[PDB]
Each structure stands twice: as structure tokens, then as C-alpha cells.
């Protein structure tokens, strides 16, 4: 009966203006960088999906701070973009590379790694930055 695909994405922006990025393992974009992101699974809530994607791709525990945006990528494709804060876990290094990601790392918002999986994350980091400024 499902007719829509919910996706989740996490923006972490530290006090030092660094963003948490993950390095993709998927063949089509292997070695490229992106935000922690993934499709919701049957049985979980959107916040549970956020936490799972962050754990799997970056190794960290987290909590959502706010919903920064909801995007209608298509009539049946919706992406929820959260500002998130780390609450524990261990940052995933390349020692732990697997199918979910090759590693995760923090980069200055203004000095991002390359190549990026997609550039749609630029705007998202700016959203976080503005939110943090407004708050």
C-alpha cells in the first residue's frame, strides 16, 4: 500500500563551523563525499531512520535538533533534512569501511572535500548555518 519514498539526510555543523561528511561506498559514486543520508526502512520512524543512517555511515549517535527542510524531489519522493547533534559513538574511520560508507570526517564548511556526490548538499549546509545564526 506504500506509494511514497521517504528519505532522510543529516546536517551536522559544529561550533568550529565544520560539517560531517561521509565517503560513499556505492559503486556509482564510490569515493565521493556527501551528507549522511538514506531511505527510511519499513518499521521505523523518520527520526529512527535519521539515527540509523548516521550510525551506519558515520558511526555516531545523534539527536535531531530541528527539521531544516522538507523537499519534494518528485511526486512520490520526499527528503527530510535535519540539523543534528552528536551524542556519542565513534567516528567511523577507513578501518571500518563497509558497504554503507568508506569513512566519515569533519571538514570546514568553506573547505569541502571533493568530489561531492551531488552539490545539493551545499545549500543544505548553508541552511544549517543560517539556522544556527538565527537561533
Is residue 20 a contact residue for Mg ion (CB under 5 A)?
A: yes
Is residue 45 a contact residue for Mg ion (CB under 5 A)?
A: no
Number of residues counted as binding Mg ion (CB under 5 A): 6
86 vs 109, beta carbon nearer Na ion? 86
CA distances from 44 to 50, 71, 121 (A): 10, 20, 24
Please, which of residues 87-116 interact with Mg ion by CB under 5 A?
91
520526499: which residue's cell? 78
Least distance from Na ion to the Cβ atom of residue 108, Å:
20
Least distance from Mg ion to the Cβ atom of residue 21, Å:
6
**Per the structure block, which three cell numbers stand in for 120?**
545539493
**Using CA atoms, how far apart are residues 55 and 58, in angstroms rounded to an integer?**
5
Least distance from Mg ion to the Cβ atom of residue 74, Å:
23
Is residue 11 a contact residue for Mg ion (CB under 5 A)?
A: yes
Q: What does 119 interact with, of Na ion, Mg ion, none (CB < 5 to 8 A by kind)?
A: Na ion
Residue 122, annotated as binding a ligand: no
Is residue 125 a contact residue for Mg ion (CB under 5 A)?
A: no
Residue pair 22/101 in contact by the 8 Å Cβ criterion: yes
- The alpha carbon torsion through 23, 24, 30, 34 (nearest 10 deg) reads -80
47 vs 105, beta carbon nearer Na ion? 47
Phi, psi of 17 (to 5 degrees): 60, 35
**Using CA atoms, how far apart are residues 53 and 51, in angstroms rounded to an integer?**
6
- The residue ranges that bind Mg ion (CB under 5 A) are 11-12, 20, 35, 91, 134
Amino acid at each position: 500500500r506504500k506509494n511514497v519514498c521517504y528519505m532522510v539526510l543529516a546536517v551536522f555543523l559544529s561550533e568550529q563551523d565544520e560539517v560531517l561528511l561521509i565517503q560513499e561506498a556505492k559503486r556509482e559514486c564510490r569515493g565521493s563525499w556527501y551528507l549522511p543520508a538514506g531511505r527510511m526502512e519499513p518499521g521505523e520512524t523518520i527520526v529512527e531512520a535519521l539515527q540509523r543512517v548516521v550510525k551506519e555511515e558515520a558511526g555516531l549517535h545523534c539527536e535531531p535538533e530541528t527539521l531544516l527542510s522538507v523537499e519534494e524531489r518528485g511526486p512520490s519522493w520526499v527528503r527530510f533534512v535535519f540539523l543534528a547533534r552528536p551524542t556519542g559513538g565513534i567516528l567511523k574511520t577507513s578501518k571500518e569501511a563497509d558497504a554503507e560508507s568508506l569513512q566519515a570526517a569533519w571538514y570546514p564548511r568553506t573547505s569541502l572535500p571533493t568530489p561531492l556526490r551531488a552539490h545539493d548538499i551545499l545549500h543544505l549546509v548553508e541552511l544549517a548555518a543560517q539556522y544556527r545564526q538565527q537561533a
